[PDB]
């Protein structure tokens, strides 16, 4: 289609959102972990991404020195990936890197185009889903991140799986937005912060770009991918969408009769 | 300072242009006739008479000017009229020219003239010309007419070998295109930005003509650049009172004498004025003008009018016939076919076959492949721009042997080819302006060349041309054809553009200074002439005769409008300018200031394409571009093709601009000429507009934005998407081929793996693989590898090692390619650093290091991107994390100690009396620093450490402890170190006359021989040595015991550890610690130094305690410090130098206007450079000798001693310079009248800031970066270096406080100021030269295992500092075992290194001991990698000739200087040496000492530079030749040893092998030797022994000359010797053999050797060899220095074999011809 | 008695110009070892990647 103009120039703008941020305040539980969330990866994350199509990333982060119930995240990993409005969908492997062994997997954060008062039952799908083919993602240590475009401003909140949720979650095979036997007891809302105190780092692809949603025929969810330090292109770079601007028949006589001037300054 | 009133430029402004018409009413010639035919009128203008010749005036003949310029006019019998009229002019003096005569008549000719001119001031000698000594500049206004003024000036002055070339290309490519040029043919505008940028800065001194060809283009909107240029010239003329010659060559117009004196031209002589009655054709012009309103009616007209006008020269004559646009060629010549056969059928004669008498030659080319198919059998044929260069060029010869009867063209063959015609006809006259939006009449100098012409100049009679035109403009093209139309100024509308660009080159200052500026410009002319024209009464005329009041008004109004735009800043109060980075940027990049405020708005760090595309949109360069409603359809088609989407509708101007160049950037077929024209006026502009806003963004470090403008640049610049192909820039490949390469998903960088088969395969088709790897494998790419190391916890040093991995192709790559450097942050968001980096053809395949300090913060980032960008390529980018996961940081440092608020101690604290009498009169308190540190350093006896800034009287605390000592014992002993050797002879000067007078105690300063160090040492009391000479002496400190019992050891300036030559200081002082351990005497260590943040480290390593441990904060300084930082943003080194002249002259006004100033530059030449510049820019300032502070009588006395021409110059005007070059004796005179007050400049360069005792007001740095030739690279100061010059601003007595002006780079501003205010950091670098030490201490048996070696590094800084900063000495931990494993490393592969070497043998794995190499390694104090090299090279066969190589290849050369264009020198001098060298590097520093060795042999003449970097190398030959001997001899080959001893001996008398003995003696030139030769005297004992009368009868001087050629042969060695073998009869087979050698000299010695061409004062040394001839084997050798009588003796064992001979050999090393030698036998049992 | 060393060089006898081209060799070849000889100063980036080994 070409209504991709009107959501670049809306995506464009996506730096204004960056000021306003709001961290859900909830009736938090203090039982399990908490989770620190550094601004800059943040800043960037919500500036790559779109507003009807959602991205997602990987969390890593480390515990720091003896205080085992915060979990500071450390890096956010782009994958190759094409998402939809309701759901975003990226491959079976998860990232590895020599980079990455020191810190383990704490989640997946994913932008979301409206705010919702409960997490999606996508969400607790594909977190089951990941959580099943992986024994490296524990139940209680993995969370979502769901970063919601509000009014002028995005808020965002932390999820966690209940073990009636995984067992719900891995069998589920219904992507309607209602599948039966879905109940808010699935999921837990944990306390999460924002931080200034400490500094994140991005990894991308090595090889193209992390986005597939314009170059969807590419992506395939068995495919594989290397991981390298660099930081993460905007969503409507040129990179991603090549369809735009590969495709160009080369004139040879058009400039037979172009107007002639001399560049003076040349 | 008047009371400037505001003036609205927009009024004052002549609109409309080049179209404004003063003449009021254009009376045209006698015979006219206008005559009216339907809807138009015509207007004839019969041809003039030729103007009869003059009485006695004829052409010149060819043979009758100078004989260099017969050359250059071959072809021509003569010169037509005007050339013989102007030829006097041209040829014979040097005086500026005006030339206004009609065009054609020959005007290029005349500035061949005067090329030749300039040419012939070179002649040089023997027919050739100098090369590199001129430039001239020709100026043209086409480029299309640039290219043919290139290709015929290259024709004609080809002979001269004179190379011509267009001025087009990048700034960087035009800096190498000027140099190698030496005429430079360019359009106004790109000189001008040239100028602009800087470019032309090296070589404006080689400029010495400069022509102005055209130049009524003044008239156009043009004209502001062209007065810009000529005032910007003679404005400096005036300035630097250099003389450049400007030839002005113009139409016959009025106003011609207004012009004239614009440009300084001499109305009497230079001024040269011929009407059109001297036009070579006589022309008989005819106009038309057509009173048609409606344009279909009119339009309708004009082709019957061509028609018409076609049909008269039908069958005789070849019609020319010019259209405005490209594609109306075609158009119009299909019409008048058409007209011309539909009716009548008139083709038939106006082609004229003849029965193909003609014709055949067209049927035969009628094989092409274009519409010129068509028209050629029929005689019609178009010329333009486009169709092929084939076609142009055939159509160009077919019509010059005219076939083709008529040719319509476009406006570029008049400019472009000379192609005259019988009869031009102009269609039209109306051309499109995309500048202007609409359609405009076209320009004045366009119909001026279009018209010229008419008629050929030998084939024609007269030829007539017709001009076509609307009948409202007929009178402007009457006055314009007939020289009937002034030349007016148009500078009013680009007045303040051009004053901006005035104020950044710095040419302006103030509004005072632009009225000067203004008062060059034609405009001012122009306003005294005629006021009533450019909006001046009258009344205000009277007012101010000079008009400086209308100037200053100009001046306000146009720096009110800088100003606003933030182009500037200007007050109102004083008129200063001050120029700010976006008028820099805008004075580069030839932008106008409303643009500059639009990019101010709007640019954002934020900013993304779409806005990016909007911002550029909104340019101010495109105000009159509109949407025209038959341009809509075809905007909205390519709105949506474009990529980049455009959020404004299509109906505004920017969404046309910003779709536009998409569309000109995805290659979109437009079918709108106007909307192309728009497309090519855009994308012209947008290369300046976006190169603007990325300098723009760049320098304010907004790195996302930085990407996405260079890449838009480049994607500009190739006409291509970066997402394309990155082989579509080679434009060789196919276009399938790359279409098909890109089709498939695939990345680029995949395709560096496949060989050539593979990509062939991969893309489908392998013939094509290998050119597409070929390809592949051409385009740039880089490797980089950084290793970073802290310096303190907040910045970090990191080098870059850039290493091409692309094959270079000159034709691909052209002469460099250029590279930008960015390190990022994390979030990529802010640039932490950048820089410009330029990679050279020849100096590609090497590895480039580039070293930057980039700042870190209490949140430890994750990591930085270090990122090198191509400045032209795309997807030419290489980026490279650098993680910040392990660095550890190093240790936070103590506060400084805190200066105690003590009352001053008074002098008489000192109890003893005769001390106070040193200090009494100098000053009669000690100052607080040396107050409080007294107690400590005069009464306790442990050791202490003082760091204070330099200039705070840290000496006095030495001289505490020295008192302090002396109180101890009566005979003391102390040693006091510096690094420098200046600085040692300085305090021991100081020290002498303290000690040796008032106290009468012993005070002695070391030398580099060790005998008499050891004397000096045994008699001495106060010792004052350098690091080096202390290390030789103390090596064997076990031997000599004088070391070990010293009772003070003070080391000063022990801050220099941490700089090069520190690890001698850091190892002399480890071993005084290490020996006071095993003493059982403590040795008292005072440390003097500059402020150190850990000088807790320091005082832990020398055993300094916490209490008597003073460092102070730098601002503890008893005279405050001024400090200024200014930034100069050039990337080239020699053009930041020549622009910062004056700003070092104005920094001298506005700090130190009547105080001594001091000038540090970083060149030798650059000294005498800015010691003229200042001069030349004193004098330019209407004070002249403001500087001198003295009467010239009184120091006429000084100024016979000194030698230097230049400096002589210099000194009367009150500047001094000061460098290496100076002898001793001018240095102190200069210096003398430096602190006399005399003069209150001296430019030192930088060496001398250690060895200058002067002390200044103000201080100026000047560029804080030196050029090191033997990495081809420049690297900047050591910070040791910018403190030691920053103390040279401290005048404690007459000052209050010291002003310092530091000049640098931009990028090295925020390094400065952190480590300049701030107590410095010092580390160790013992473990790169760890090797000599090491070896040093295993001769002398203190090193015998590895673990001593280990022990041995637990003494030493490095040891200190490799825990609290481990990263810096690559230690990636801080445990114990780390820094064990780290150490046992080290020391095990320094051990590898020496036992590989063979200086040293570990035998089995912990034991080590001293081999030969290591020992004589470590006796002459030479790097063993030296040894190693002479080992390795040295055989049984080296003769002199590879003697000289292998010294030259020496470690000690290693650090000989390589200075710019030292090349040319190297070359003209290798060409010379009686041996040269097979394809040397002459960066190499070993082969400039190899040809510098040769030319001092071969006592050739060199520069004074040359002959300072001699006698550094002739310094160190002698020990490096006795090395060889001793290596030689080791091994125990005979005749390379002899060679080595005759090479030390002639290298001593500076003369060959082969010359003649006598050359030694003074005063002998080769005549002397030729008439000693035929007597038979060859030897000087042939003359000493000779006859005083016939000796001064074969030698022809004065008595004085011939006493010391006398004298010499007295000091000549006259010895002889006698030999015998101790018990010869009793030898047997493998027994000791004692042969005895003793030698008595008879006269008696007078001194040391006579060697003045030597720079050191050598001493007689000899050598006693015993070996076999036939054999070639050295059984034994001696060295020794005989003074009167001497004794030696030699053993050896006997061979097996009974009978044996022996020569005994006999060598010097001082002189030639005195060797000996004998021949004896033993006889041996068995 | 006085012998002299009387100079006979015969113009290096006639040196050959491949004898310089070894020592040129074995000086390239023995510099080349000593260029390889040299250690870095800091730490590399990929060092800072990997850090300690255990």
């Known amino acids: 289609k070409t209504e991709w103009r009107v959501r670049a120039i809306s995506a464009a703008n996506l730096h204004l959102r960056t000021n306003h941020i709001y961290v859900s305040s909830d009736d938090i539980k203090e039982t399990g972990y908490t989770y620190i969330l550094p601004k800059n990866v943040l800043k960037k994350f919500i500036c790559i991404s779109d507003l009807r199509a959602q991205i997602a990333g990987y969390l890593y982060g480390v515990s720091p020195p003896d205080n085992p119930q915060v979990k500071e995240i450390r890096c956010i990993v782009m994958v190759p990936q094409w998402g939809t409005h309701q759901t975003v969908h990226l491959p079976g492997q998860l990232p590895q890197h020599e980079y990455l062994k020191e810190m383990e997997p704490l989640g997946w954060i994913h932008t979301q185009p409206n705010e919702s008062p409960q997490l999606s039952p996508q969400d607790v799908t594909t977190h089951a889903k990941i959580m099943a083919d992986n024994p490296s993602w524990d139940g209680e240590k993995t969370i979502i991140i769901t970063c919601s475009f509000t009014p002028g401003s995005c808020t965002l909140t932390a999820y966690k799986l209940t073990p009636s949720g995984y067992e719900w979650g891995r069998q589920n095979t219904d992507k309607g937005n209602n599948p039966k036997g879905y109940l808010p007891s699935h999921y837990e809302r944990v306390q999460m912060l924002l931080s200034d105190r400490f500094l994140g780092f991005f990894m991308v692809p090595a090889q193209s770009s992390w986005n597939y949603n314009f170059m969807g025929v590419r992506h395939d969810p068995n495919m594989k991918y290397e991981l390298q330090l660099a930081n993460p292109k905007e969503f409507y770079h040129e990179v991603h969408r090549p369809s735009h601007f590969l495709n160009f028949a080369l004139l040879q006589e058009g400039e037979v009769y172009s107007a002639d001037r001399e560049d003076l300054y040349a | 300072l008047a009371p400037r009133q505001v003036l609205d430029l927009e009024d004052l402004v002549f609109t409309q242009g080049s179209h404004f018409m003063a003449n009021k009413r254009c009376q045209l010639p006698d015979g006219s006739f206008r005559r009216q035919r339907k809807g138009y009128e015509e207007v004839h203008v019969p041809a003039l008479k030729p103007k009869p010749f003059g009485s006695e005036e004829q052409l010149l003949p060819v043979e009758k000017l100078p004989k260099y310029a017969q050359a250059g006019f071959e072809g021509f019998k003569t010169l037509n009229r005007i050339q013989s009229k102007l030829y006097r002019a041209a040829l014979e003096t040097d005086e500026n020219l005006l030339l206004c005569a009609p065009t054609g008549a020959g005007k290029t000719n005349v500035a061949l003239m005067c090329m030749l001119r300039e040419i012939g001031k070179h002649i040089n000698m023997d027919g050739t010309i100098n090369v590199d000594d001129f430039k001239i500049i020709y100026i043209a206004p086409m480029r299309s007419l640039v290219q043919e003024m290139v290709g015929s000036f290259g024709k004609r002055l080809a002979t001269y070998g004179i190379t011509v070339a267009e001025l087009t290309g990048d700034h960087q490519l035009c800096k190498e295109e000027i140099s190698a040029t030496q005429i430079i043919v360019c359009t106004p505008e790109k000189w001008d930005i040239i100028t602009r940028k800087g470019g032309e800065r090296t070589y404006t001194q080689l400029v010495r003509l400069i022509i102005l060809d055209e130049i009524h283009l003044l008239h156009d909107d043009r004209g502001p650049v062209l007065e810009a240029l000529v005032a910007r010239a003679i404005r400096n003329i005036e300035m630097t009172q250099e003389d450049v010659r400007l030839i002005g060559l113009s139409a016959t117009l009025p106003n011609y004498e207004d012009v004239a004196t614009f440009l300084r031209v001499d109305p009497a002589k230079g001024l040269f004025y011929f009407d059109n009655s001297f036009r070579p054709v006589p022309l008989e012009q005819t106009y038309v003008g057509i009173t048609e ?13 061509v028609y018409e006008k076609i049909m008269e020269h039908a069958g005789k004559n070849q019609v020319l016939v010019f259209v405005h646009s490209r594609k109306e060629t075609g158009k119009t010549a299909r019409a008048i076919r058409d007209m011309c056969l539909e009716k009548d059928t008139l083709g038939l004669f106006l082609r004229e076959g003849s029965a193909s008498t003609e014709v055949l030659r067209t049927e035969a080319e009628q094989c092409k492949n274009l519409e010129l198919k068509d028209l050629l059998p029929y005689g019609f044929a178009i010329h333009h721009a486009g169709m092929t260069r084939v076609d142009r060029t055939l159509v160009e010869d077919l019509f010059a042997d005219k076939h083709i009867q008529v040719l319509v063209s476009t406006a570029t063959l008049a400019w472009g080819v000379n192609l005259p015609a019988h009869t031009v006809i102009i269609k039209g006259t109306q051309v499109y302006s995309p500048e202007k939006g609409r359609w405009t009449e076209l320009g004045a100098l366009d119909i001026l060349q279009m018209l010229g012409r008419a008629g050929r100049p030998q084939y024609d009679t007269k030829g007539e041309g017709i001009l076509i035109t609307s009948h409202g403009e007929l009178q402007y093209y009457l006055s314009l054809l007939n020289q009937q139309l002034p030349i007016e100024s148009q500078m009013v509308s680009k007045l303040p553009d051009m004053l901006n660009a005035e104020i950044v080159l710095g040419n302006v200052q103030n509004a005072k200074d632009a009225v000067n500026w203004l008062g060059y410009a034609y405009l001012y002319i122009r306003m005294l002439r005629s006021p009533t024209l450019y909006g001046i009464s009258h009344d205000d005329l009277k007012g101010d005769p000079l008009l400086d009041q209308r100037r200053l008004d100009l001046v306000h109004t146009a720096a009110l409008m800088l100003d606003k735009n933030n182009l500037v800043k200007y007050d109102k109060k004083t008129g200063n300018f001050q120029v700010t980075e976006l008028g820099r940027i805008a004075s580069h990049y030839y932008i106008t200031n409303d643009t500059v405020q639009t990019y101010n708005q709007l640019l954002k760090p934020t900013l993304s394409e779409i806005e990016l595309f909007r911002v550029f949109s909104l340019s101010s360069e495109f105000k009159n571009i509109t949407v025209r409603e038959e341009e809509k359809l075809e905007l909205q088609k390519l709105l949506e093709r474009v990529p980049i989407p455009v959020k404004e509708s299509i109906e505004e101007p920017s969404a046309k601009i910003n779709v536009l160049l998409q569309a000109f950037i995805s290659q979109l077929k437009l079918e709108g000429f106007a909307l192309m024209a728009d497309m090519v006026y855009v994308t012209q502009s947008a290369g300046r507009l976006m190169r603007a806003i990325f300098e723009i963004v760049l320098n304010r470090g907004w790195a996302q934005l930085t990407d996405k403008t260079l890449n838009l640049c480049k994607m500009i610049d190739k006409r291509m998407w970066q997402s394309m192909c990155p082989l579509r820039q080679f434009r060789k490949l196919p276009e399938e081929v790359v279409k098909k390469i890109e089709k498939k998903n695939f990345p680029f960088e995949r395709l560096y793996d496949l060989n050539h088969n593979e990509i062939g395969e991969l893309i489908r088709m392998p013939k094509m693989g290998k050119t597409i790897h070929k390809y592949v494998h051409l385009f740039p790419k880089l490797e980089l590898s950084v290793h970073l190391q802290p310096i303190t916890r907040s910045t970090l040093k990191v080098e870059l090692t850039i290493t091409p991995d692309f094959q270079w192709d000159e034709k691909v790559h052209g002469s460099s390619e250029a590279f930008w450097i960015l390190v990022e942050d994390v979030d990529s968001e802010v640039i932490l650093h950048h820089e410009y980096f330029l990679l050279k053809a020849k100096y590609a395949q090497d590895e480039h290091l580039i070293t930057f300090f980039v700042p870190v913060f209490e949140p430890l980032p994750p990591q930085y991107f270090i990122r090198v960008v191509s400045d032209r390529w795309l997807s030419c980018e290489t980026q490279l994390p650098v993680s910040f996961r392990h660095l550890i940081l190093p240790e936070k440092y103590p506060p400084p100690t805190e200066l105690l608020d003590l009352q001053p101690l008074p002098v008489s604290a000192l109890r003893n009396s005769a001390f106070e009498s040193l200090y009494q009169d100098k000053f009669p308190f000690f100052n607080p620093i040396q107050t409080q540190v007294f107690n400590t350093v005069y009464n306790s006896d442990d050791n202490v450490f003082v760091g204070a800034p330099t200039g705070s009287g840290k000496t006095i605390c030495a001289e505490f402890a020295i008192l302090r000592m002396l109180l101890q014992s009566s005979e003391g002993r102390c040693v006091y170190i510096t690094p420098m050797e200046a600085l040692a002879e300085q305090v021991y000067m100081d020290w002498y006359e303290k000690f040796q007078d008032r106290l009468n105690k012993k005070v002695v300063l070391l030398t580099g021989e060790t005998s008499t160090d050891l004397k000096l040492l045994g008699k001495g009391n106060i010792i004052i040595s350098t690091p080096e000479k202390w290390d030789i002496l103390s090596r064997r400190w076990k031997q000599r015991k004088n070391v070990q019992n010293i009772n003070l050891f003070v080391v000063d300036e022990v801050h220099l550890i941490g700089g090069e030559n520190g690890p001698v200081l850091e190892v002399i002082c480890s071993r005084m610690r290490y020996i006071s351990s095993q003493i059982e005497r403590p040795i008292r260590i005072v440390a003097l130094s500059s402020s150190l943040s850990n000088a807790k480290d320091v005082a832990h390593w020398l055993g300094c305690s916490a209490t008597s441990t003073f460092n102070f904060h730098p601002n503890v300084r008893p005279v405050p410090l001024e400090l200024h930082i200014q930034g100069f943003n050039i990337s080239h080194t020699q053009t930041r130098l020549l622009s910062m002249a004056k700003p070092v002259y104005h920094a001298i006004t506005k700090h130190s206007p009547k105080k001594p100033v001091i000038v540090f530059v970083p060149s030798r030449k650059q000294t005498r450079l800015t010691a003229i510049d200042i001069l030349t820019t004193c004098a330019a300032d209407i004070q002249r000798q403001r500087f001198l502070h003295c009467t010239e009588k009184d120091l006429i006395p000084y100024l016979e001693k000194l030698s ?4 002589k110059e210099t000194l009367l005007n009150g500047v001094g310079y000061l460098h290496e070059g100076l002898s001793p004796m001018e240095r102190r005179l200069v210096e003398q009248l430096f602190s006399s007050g005399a003069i209150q400049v001296v430019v030192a360069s930088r060496s001398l800031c250690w060895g200058m005792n002067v002390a200044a007001h103000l201080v100026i740095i000047m560029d804080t970066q030196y050029y090191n030739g033997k990495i081809h690279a420049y690297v900047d100061y050591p910070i040791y270096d910018v403190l030691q010059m920053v103390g040279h601003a401290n005048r404690p007595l007459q000052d209050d406080e ?58 030493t800084f490095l040891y200190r500092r490799m825990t609290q900063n481990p990263n810096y000495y690559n230690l990636q931990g801080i445990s114990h075992r780390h820094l064990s494993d780290h150490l046992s490393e080290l020391v095990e592969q320094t051990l590898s290194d020496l036992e590989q070497s063979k200086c040293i043998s570990i035998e089995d794995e912990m034991d080590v001991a001293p081999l030969n190499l290591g020992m004589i390694a470590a006796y002459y104090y030479i790097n063993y990698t030296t040894i190693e090299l002479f080992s390795m090279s040295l055989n049984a066969k080296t003769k002199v000739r590879g003697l000289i190589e292998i010294i030259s290849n020496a470690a000690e050369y290693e650090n000989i200087p390589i200075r710019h264009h030292e090349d040319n020198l190297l070359r003209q001098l290798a060409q010379k040496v009686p041996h040269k060298l097979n394809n040397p590097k002459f ?95 060859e030897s000087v004992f042939d003359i000493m022994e000779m006859e005083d009368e016939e000796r001064n009868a074969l030698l022809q001087l004065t008595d004085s000359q011939i006493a010391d050629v006398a004298r010499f ?118 | 008695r006085k012998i002299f060393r009387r100079r006979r060089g015969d113009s290096e006898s006639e040196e050959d110009e491949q004898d310089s081209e070894e020592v040129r060799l074995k000086l390239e070849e023995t510099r080349e070892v000593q260029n390889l ?18």
């Open chain 2, 1609 to 1726: 042969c007295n000091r000549y060695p006259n010895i002889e010797l006698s030999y015998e073998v101790v018990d010869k009869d009793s030898i047997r087979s493998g027994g000791p053999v004692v042969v005895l050698v003793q030698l008595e000299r008879e006269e008696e010695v007078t001194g040391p050797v006579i060697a003045p061409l030597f720079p050191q004062k050598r001493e007689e040394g000899w050598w006693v060899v015993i070996g076999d001839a036939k054999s070639n084997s050295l059984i034994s050798i001696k060295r020794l220095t005989l003074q009167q009588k001497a004794k030696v003796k030699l053993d050896f064992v006997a061979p097996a074999t009974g009978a044996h001979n022996y020569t005994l050999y006999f060598m010097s090393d001082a002189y030639m011809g005195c060797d000996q030698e004998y021949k004896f036998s033993v006889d041996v049992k068995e």
């Open chain 2, 1298 to 1355: 010291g002003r310092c002006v530091i000049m640098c780079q931009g990028s090295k501003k925020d390094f400065f100021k952190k480590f300049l205010y701030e107590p410095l950091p010092v580390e160790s670098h013992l473990d790169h030269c760890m090797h000599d030490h090491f070896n040093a201490e295993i001769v002398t048996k203190t090193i015998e295992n590895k673990q001593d070696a280990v022990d041995y590094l637990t003494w």
């Open chain 2, 293 to 305: 309103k409606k344009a279909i009616k009119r339009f309708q007209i004009m082709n019957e009018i």
């Open chain 2, 1483 to 1577: 960066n190499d520093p070993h082969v400039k000492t190899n040809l510098l060795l040769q030319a001092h042999l071969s006592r050739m003449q060199l520069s004074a530079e040359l002959q300072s970097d001699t006698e550094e190398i002739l310094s160190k030959a002698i020990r490096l030749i006795q090395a060889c001997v001793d290596v030689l001899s080791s091994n125990g080959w005979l005749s390379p040893a002899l060679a080595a001893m005759e090479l030390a001996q002639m290298v001593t008398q500076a003369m060959w092998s082969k010359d003649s003995y006598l050359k030694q003696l003074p005063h002998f030139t080769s005549e002397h030797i030729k008439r000693c030769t035929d007597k038979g005297v």
């Open chain 3, 37 to 54: 000889r040299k250690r870095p100063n800091g730490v590399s980036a990929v060092a800072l990647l990997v850090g300690e080994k255990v």
């Open chain 2, 1204 to 1207: 230097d021409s230049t400096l």
